[PDB]
Coordinates of C-alpha atoms and ligand atoms in Angstrom, one line a residue:
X1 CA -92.0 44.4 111.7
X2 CA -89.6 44.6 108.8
X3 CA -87.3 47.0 110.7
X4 CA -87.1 44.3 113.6
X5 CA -86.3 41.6 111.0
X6 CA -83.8 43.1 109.4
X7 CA -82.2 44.9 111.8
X8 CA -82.0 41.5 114.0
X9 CA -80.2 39.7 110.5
X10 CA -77.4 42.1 110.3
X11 CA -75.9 42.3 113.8
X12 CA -76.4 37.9 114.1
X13 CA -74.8 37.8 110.4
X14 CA -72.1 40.7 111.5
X15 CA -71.1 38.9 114.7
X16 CA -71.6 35.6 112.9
X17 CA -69.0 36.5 110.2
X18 CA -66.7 38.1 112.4
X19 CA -66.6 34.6 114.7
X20 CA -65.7 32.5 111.8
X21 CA -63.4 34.4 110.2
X22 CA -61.0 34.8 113.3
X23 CA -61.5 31.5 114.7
X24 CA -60.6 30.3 111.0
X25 CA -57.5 32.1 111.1
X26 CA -56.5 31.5 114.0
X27 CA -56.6 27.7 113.5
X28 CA -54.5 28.1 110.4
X29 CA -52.1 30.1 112.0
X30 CA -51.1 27.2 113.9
X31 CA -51.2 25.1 111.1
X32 CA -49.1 27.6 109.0
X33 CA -46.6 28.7 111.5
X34 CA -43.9 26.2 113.1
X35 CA -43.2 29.1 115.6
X36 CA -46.7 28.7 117.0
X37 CA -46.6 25.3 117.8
X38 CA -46.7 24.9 121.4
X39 CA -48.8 23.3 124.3
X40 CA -50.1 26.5 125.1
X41 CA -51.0 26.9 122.0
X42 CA -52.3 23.6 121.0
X43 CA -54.7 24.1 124.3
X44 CA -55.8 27.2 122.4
X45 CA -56.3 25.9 119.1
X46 CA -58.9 23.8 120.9
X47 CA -61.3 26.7 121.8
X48 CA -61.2 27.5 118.0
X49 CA -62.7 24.4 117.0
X50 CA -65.5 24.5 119.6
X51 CA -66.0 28.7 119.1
X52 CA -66.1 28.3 114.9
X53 CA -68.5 25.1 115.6
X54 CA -71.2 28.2 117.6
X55 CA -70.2 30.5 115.3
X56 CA -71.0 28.4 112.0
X57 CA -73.8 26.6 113.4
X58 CA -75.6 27.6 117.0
X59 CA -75.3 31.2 115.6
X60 CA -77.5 30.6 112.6
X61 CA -80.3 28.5 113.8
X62 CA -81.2 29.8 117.0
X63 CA -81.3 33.3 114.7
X64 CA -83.4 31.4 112.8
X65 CA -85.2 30.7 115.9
X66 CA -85.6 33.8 117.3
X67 CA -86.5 35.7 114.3
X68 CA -89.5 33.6 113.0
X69 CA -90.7 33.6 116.6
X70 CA -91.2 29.5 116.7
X71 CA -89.1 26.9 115.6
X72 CA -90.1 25.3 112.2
X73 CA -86.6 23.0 111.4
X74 CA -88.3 19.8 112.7
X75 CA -87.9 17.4 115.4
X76 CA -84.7 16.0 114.9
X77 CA -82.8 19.1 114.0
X78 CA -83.8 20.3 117.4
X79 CA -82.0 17.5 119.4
X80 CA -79.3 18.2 117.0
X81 CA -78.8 21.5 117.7
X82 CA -79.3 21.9 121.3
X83 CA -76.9 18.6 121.9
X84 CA -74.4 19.9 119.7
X85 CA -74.8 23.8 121.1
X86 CA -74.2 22.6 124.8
X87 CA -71.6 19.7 124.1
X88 CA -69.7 22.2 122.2
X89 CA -69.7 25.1 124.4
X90 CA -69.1 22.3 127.2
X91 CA -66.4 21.2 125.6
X92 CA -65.6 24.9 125.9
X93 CA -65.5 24.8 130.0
X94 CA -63.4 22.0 129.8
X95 CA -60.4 23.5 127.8
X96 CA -60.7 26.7 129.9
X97 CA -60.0 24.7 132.9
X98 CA -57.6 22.8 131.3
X99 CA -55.5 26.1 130.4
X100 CA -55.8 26.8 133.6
X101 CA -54.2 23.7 135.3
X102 CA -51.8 23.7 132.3
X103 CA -50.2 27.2 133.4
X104 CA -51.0 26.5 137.1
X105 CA -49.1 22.9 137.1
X106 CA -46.5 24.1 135.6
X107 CA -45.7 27.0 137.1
X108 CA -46.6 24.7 140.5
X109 CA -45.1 21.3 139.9
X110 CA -41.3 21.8 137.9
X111 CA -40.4 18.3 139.3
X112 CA -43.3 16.6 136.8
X113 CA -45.8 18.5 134.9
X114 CA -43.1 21.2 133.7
X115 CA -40.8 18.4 132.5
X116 CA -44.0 15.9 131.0
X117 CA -45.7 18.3 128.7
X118 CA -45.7 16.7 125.5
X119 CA -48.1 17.7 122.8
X120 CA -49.3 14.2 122.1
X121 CA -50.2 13.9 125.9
X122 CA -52.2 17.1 124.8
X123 CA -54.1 15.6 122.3
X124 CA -55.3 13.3 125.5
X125 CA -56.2 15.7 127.6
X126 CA -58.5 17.1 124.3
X127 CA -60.4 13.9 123.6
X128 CA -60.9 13.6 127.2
X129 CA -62.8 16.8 127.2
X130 CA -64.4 16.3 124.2
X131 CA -65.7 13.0 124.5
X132 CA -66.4 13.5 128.2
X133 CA -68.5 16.9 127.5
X134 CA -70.5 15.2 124.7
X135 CA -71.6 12.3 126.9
X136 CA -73.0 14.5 129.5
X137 CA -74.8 16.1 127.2
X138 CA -75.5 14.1 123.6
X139 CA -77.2 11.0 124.9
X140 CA -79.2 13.0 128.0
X141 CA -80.8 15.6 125.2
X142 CA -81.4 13.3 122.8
X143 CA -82.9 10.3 124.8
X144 CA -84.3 11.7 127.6
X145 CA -88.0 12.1 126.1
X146 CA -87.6 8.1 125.3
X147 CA -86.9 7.3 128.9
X148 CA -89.8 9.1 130.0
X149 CA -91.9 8.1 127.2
X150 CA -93.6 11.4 126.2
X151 CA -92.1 14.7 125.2
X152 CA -92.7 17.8 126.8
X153 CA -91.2 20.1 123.8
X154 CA -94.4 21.7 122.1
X155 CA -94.3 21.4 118.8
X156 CA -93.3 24.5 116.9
X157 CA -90.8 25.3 120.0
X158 CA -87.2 23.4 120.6
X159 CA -85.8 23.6 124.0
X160 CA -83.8 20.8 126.5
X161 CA -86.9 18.9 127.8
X162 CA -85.2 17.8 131.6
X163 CA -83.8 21.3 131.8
X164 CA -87.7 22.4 132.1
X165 CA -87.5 22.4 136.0
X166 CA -86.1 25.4 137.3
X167 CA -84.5 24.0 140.5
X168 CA -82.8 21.2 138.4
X169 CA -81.5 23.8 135.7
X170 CA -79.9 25.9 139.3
X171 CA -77.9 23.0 139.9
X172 CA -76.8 22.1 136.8
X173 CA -75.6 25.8 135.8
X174 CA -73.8 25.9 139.1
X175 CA -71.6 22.2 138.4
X176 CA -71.1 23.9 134.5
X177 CA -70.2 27.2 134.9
X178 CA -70.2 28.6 138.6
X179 CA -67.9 26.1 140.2
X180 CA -65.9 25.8 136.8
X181 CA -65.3 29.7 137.1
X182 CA -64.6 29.5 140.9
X183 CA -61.7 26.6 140.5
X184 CA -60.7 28.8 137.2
X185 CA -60.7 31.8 139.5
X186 CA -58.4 30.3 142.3
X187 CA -55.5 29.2 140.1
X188 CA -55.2 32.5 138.4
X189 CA -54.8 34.9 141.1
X190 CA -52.1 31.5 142.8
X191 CA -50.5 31.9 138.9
X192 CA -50.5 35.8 139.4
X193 CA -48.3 36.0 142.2
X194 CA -45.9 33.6 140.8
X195 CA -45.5 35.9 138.2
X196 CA -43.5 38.7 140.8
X197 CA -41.0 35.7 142.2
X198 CA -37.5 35.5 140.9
X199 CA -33.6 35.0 142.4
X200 CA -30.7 33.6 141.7
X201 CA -31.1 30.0 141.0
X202 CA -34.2 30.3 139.1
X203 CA -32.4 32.8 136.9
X204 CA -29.2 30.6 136.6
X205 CA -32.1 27.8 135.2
X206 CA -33.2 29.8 132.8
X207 CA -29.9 30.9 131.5
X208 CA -28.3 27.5 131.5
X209 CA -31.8 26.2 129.9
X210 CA -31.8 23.2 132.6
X211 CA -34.6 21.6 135.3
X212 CA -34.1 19.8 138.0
X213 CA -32.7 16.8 139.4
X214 CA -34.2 16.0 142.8
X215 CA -33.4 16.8 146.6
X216 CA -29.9 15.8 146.4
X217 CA -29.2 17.7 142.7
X218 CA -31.0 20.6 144.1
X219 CA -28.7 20.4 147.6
X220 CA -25.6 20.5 145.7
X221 CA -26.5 23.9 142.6
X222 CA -27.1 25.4 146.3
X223 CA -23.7 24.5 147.4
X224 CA -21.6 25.9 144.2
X225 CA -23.9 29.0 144.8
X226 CA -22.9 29.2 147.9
X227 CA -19.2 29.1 147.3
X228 CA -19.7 31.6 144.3
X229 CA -20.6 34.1 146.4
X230 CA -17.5 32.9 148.2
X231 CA -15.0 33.7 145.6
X232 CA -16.5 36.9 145.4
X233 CA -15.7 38.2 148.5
X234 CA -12.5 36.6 148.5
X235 CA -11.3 38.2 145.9
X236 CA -9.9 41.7 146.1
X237 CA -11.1 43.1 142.4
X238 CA -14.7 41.8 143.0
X239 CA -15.7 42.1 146.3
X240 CA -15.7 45.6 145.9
X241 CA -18.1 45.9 142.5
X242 CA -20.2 42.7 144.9
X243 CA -20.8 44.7 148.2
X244 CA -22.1 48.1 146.4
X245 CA -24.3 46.4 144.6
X246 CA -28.0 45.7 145.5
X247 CA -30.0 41.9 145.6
X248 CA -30.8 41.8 141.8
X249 CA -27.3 43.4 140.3
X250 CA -25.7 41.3 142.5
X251 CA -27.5 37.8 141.2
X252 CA -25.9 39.3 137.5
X253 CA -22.3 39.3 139.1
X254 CA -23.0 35.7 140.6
X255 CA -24.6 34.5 137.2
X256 CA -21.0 35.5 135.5
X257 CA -18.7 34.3 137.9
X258 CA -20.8 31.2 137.6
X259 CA -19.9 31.4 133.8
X260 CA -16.6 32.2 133.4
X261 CA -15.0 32.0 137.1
X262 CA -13.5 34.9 139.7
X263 CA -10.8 35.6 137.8
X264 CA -12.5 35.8 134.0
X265 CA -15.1 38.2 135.6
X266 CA -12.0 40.2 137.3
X267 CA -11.0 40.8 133.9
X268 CA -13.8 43.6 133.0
X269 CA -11.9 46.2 134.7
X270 CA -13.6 48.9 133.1
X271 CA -16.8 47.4 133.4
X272 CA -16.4 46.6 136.9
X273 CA -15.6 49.9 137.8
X274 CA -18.7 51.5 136.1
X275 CA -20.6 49.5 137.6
X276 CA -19.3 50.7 141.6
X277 CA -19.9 54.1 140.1
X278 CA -23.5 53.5 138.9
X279 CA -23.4 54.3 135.7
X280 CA -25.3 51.4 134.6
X281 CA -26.0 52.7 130.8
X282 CA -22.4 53.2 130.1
X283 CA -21.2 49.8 131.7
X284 CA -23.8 48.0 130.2
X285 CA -22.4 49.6 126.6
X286 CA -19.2 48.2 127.6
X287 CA -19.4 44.9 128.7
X288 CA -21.8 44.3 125.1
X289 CA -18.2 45.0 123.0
X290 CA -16.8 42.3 124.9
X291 CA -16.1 38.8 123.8
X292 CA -18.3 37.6 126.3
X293 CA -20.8 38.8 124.8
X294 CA -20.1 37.3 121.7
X295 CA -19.8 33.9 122.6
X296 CA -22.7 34.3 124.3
X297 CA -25.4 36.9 123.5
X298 CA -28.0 35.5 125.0
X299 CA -27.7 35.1 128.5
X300 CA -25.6 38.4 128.0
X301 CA -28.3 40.5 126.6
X302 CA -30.3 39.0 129.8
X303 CA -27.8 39.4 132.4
X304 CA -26.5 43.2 130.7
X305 CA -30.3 44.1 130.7
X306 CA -30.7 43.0 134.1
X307 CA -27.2 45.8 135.3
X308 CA -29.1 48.7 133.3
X309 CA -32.4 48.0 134.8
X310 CA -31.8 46.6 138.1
X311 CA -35.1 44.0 137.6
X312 CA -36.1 40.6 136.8
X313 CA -38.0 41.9 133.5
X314 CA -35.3 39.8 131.1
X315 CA -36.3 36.9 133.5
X316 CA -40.1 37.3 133.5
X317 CA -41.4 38.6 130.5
X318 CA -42.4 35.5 129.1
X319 CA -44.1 34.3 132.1
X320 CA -46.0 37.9 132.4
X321 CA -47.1 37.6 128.6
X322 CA -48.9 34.6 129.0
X323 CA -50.3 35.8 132.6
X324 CA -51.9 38.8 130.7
X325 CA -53.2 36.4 127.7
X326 CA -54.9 34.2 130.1
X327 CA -56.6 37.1 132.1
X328 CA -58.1 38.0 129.1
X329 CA -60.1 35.0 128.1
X330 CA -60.9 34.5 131.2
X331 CA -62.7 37.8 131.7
X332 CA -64.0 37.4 128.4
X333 CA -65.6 34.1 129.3
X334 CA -66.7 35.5 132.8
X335 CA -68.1 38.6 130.9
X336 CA -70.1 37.4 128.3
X337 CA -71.8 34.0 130.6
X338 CA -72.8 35.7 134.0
X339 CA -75.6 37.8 132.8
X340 CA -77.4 34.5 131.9
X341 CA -76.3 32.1 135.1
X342 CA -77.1 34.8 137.6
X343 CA -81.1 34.5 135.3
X344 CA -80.9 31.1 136.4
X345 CA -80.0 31.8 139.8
X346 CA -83.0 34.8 139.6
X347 CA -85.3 32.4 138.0
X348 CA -85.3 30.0 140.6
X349 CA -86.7 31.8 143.1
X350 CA -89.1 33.3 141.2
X351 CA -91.8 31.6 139.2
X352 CA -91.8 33.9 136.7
X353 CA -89.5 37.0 136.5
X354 CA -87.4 36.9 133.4
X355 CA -88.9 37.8 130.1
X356 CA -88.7 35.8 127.1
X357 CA -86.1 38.3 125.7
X358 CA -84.0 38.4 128.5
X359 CA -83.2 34.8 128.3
X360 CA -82.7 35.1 124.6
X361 CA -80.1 37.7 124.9
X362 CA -78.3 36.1 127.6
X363 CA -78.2 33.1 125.3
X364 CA -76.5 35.3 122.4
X365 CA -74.4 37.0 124.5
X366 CA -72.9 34.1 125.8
X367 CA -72.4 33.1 121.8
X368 CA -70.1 36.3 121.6
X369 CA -67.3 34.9 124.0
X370 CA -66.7 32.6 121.2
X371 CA -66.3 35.8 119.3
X372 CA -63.7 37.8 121.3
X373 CA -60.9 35.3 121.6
X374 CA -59.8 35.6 118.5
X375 CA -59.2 39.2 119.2
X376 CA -58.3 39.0 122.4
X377 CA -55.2 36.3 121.0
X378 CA -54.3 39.6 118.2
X379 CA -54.4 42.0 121.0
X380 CA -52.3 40.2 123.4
X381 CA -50.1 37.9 121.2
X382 CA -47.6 39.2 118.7
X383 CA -47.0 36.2 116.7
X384 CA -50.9 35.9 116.2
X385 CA -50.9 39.6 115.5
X386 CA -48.2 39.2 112.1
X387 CA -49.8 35.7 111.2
X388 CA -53.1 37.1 110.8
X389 CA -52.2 40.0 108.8
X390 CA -50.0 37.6 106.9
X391 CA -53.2 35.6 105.6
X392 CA -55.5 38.0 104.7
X393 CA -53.1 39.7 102.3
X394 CA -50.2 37.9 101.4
Ligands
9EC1 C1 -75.2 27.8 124.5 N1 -75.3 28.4 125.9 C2 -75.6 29.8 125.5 C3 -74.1 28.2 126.6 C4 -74.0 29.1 127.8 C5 -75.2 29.0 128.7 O1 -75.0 28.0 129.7 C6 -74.5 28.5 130.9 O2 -74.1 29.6 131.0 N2 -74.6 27.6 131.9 C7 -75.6 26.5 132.0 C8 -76.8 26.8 132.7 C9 -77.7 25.8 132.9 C10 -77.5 24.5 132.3 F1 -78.4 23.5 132.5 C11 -76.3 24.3 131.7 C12 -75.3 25.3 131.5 C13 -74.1 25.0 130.8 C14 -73.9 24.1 129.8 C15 -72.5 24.1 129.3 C16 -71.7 25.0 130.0 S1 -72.6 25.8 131.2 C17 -76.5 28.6 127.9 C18 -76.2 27.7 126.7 C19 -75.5 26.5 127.3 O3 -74.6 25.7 126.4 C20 -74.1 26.8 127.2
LIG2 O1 -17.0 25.3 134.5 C1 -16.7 25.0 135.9 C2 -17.0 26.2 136.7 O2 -16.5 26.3 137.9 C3 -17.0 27.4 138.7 O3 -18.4 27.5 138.5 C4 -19.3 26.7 139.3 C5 -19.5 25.4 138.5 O4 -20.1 25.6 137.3 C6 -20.4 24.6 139.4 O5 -20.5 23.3 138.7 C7 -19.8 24.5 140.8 O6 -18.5 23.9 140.6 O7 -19.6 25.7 141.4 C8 -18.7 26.6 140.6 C9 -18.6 27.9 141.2 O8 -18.2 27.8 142.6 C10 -16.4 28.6 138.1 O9 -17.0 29.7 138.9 C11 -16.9 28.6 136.7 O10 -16.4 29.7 136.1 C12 -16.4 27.4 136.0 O11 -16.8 27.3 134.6

């Protein structure tokens, strides 16, 4: 009826619109921002292309599809669309897992992945994808009904022709999505843990902004460690302030005697006292009017935050963020696609159980991942959060 029609043309449109217009902004933001500009973020910029291609394309044609209850754009715009719909959303797969072994390699391999990220390697790793996913895809929909001779695509009705056969459909979703999400589903909760693990030398890397240099370069930042701690007890003014401190506190004292020696850290007399008597909000007030912290706000700021709090939170907050972004679009992804893979997992066992509709909604549903990641990159991401805003108005 005309309710169904129109009712059907708002909510496609309305979700349409909403898909172009963030994954439009986000792209820009990365062109517009030199802050943005990142290997994360280039990985990102990635899905954009792929989600705006389903939102300005696959959205509107299979509506079109849906609504006048056949297919009437012809025989060619059909192997268009369906080669372009599943490269792209391929292509989609791809940079997932990529994201994935980005954060997973380099929170797993420092020696070479951490130090090797360059974003023109990136753009590699992108045209692999891109290229690989349309060749899997492109020249099996579009030639497959020359190969057999005939097609099996009624007229009137546009749908993947090999894909017909319910048992070969099973075992292509589970190579495309289920083992995908099950590789995609390992590395997070491995990158999840990480995220907990912090001591002493890690948070002397971080503040000193250095890597590192093999077996023997690693054997010897353990041995002036070592003879840090050393010094420490030596020393009559620190060992004190040292010994009533607890695991964390006491990587802050190592990370200034590592900075300015025993006897410069011996000088915050004040500040080491406070700090025997606890009152971590009042010594952290002092040592910030010192000249230390002057020279060096920075790793002050970090190792000061790290006396009030007594955690690792100025030494994994970074690492958390992007732990929380890429839960997100992973849930979103794994969301929005298993209604319609566990149909095809139904389907095969049944000879007919799904109706017509069901599939259909799976189908758009799956459209509206490439919908949420724009939102999902505002909600978790500040600077995406203030670049956005800054393009609509100003
Ligand atoms: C546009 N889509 C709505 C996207 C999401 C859905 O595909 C799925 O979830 N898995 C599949 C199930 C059977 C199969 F032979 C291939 C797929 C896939 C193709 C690409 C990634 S998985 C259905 C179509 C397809 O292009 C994707
Ligand atoms: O700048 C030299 C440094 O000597 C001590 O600190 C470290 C040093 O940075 C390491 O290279 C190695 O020598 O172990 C030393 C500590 O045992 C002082 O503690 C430090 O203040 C001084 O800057």
């Amino acid at each position: 009826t005309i309710w169904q029609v129109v009712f059907i043309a708002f909510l496609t449109g309305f979700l349409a619109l909403v898909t172009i217009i963030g994954n439009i902004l986000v792209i820009v933001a990365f062109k517009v921002n030199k802050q943005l500009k990142t290997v994360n973020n280039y990985f990102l910029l990635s899905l954009a292309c792929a989600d705006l291609i389903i939102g300005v394309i696959s959205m509107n044609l299979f509506t079109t599809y849906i609504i006048m209850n056949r297919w009437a754009l012809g025989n060619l715009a059909c192997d268009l669309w369906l080669s372009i719909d599943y490269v792209a959303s391929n292509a989609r797969v791809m940079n997932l897992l990529v994201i994935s072994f980005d954060r997973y390699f380099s929170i797993t391999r420092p020696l070479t992945y951490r130090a090797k990220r360059t974003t023109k390697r990136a753009g590699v790793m992108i045209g692999l994808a891109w290229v690989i996913s349309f060749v899997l895809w492109a020249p099996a929909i579009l030639f497959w009904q020359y190969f057999v001779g005939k097609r099996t695509v009624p007229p009137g009705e546009c749908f993947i022709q090999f894909l017909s056969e319910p048992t070969i459909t099973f075992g292509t979703a589970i190579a495309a999505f289920y083992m995908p999400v099950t590789i995609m589903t390992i590395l997070y909760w491995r990158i999840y843990k990480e995220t907990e693990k912090m001591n002493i030398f890690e948070m002397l890397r971080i503040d000193e902004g250095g890597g590192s240099g093999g077996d023997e370069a690693e054997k010897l930042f353990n041995q002036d460690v070592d003879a840090a701690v050393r010094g420490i007890l030596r020393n009559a003014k620190l060992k004190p302030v040292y010994d009533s401190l607890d695991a964390v506190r006491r990587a802050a004292l190592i990370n200034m005697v590592f900075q300015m020696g025993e006897t410069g850290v011996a000088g915050f007399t004040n500040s080491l006292r406070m700090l025997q008597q606890k009152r971590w909000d009042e010594a952290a007030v002092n040592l910030a009017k010192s000249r230390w912290y002057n020279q060096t706000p920075n790793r002050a700021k970090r190792v000061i935050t790290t006396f009030r709090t007594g955690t690792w939170d100025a030494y994994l907050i970074k690492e958390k963020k992007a732990a929380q972004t890429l839960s997100a679009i992973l849930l979103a992804f794994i969301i929005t696609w298993t209604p319609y893979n566990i149909m095809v997992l139904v389907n095969t066992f049944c000879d007919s159980c799904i109706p017509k509709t069901y599939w259909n909604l799976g189908y758009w549903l799956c459209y509206i991942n490439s919908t949420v990641n724009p939102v999902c990159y505002a909600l978790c991401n500040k600077t995406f959060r203030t670049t956005f805003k800054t393009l609509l108005l100003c």
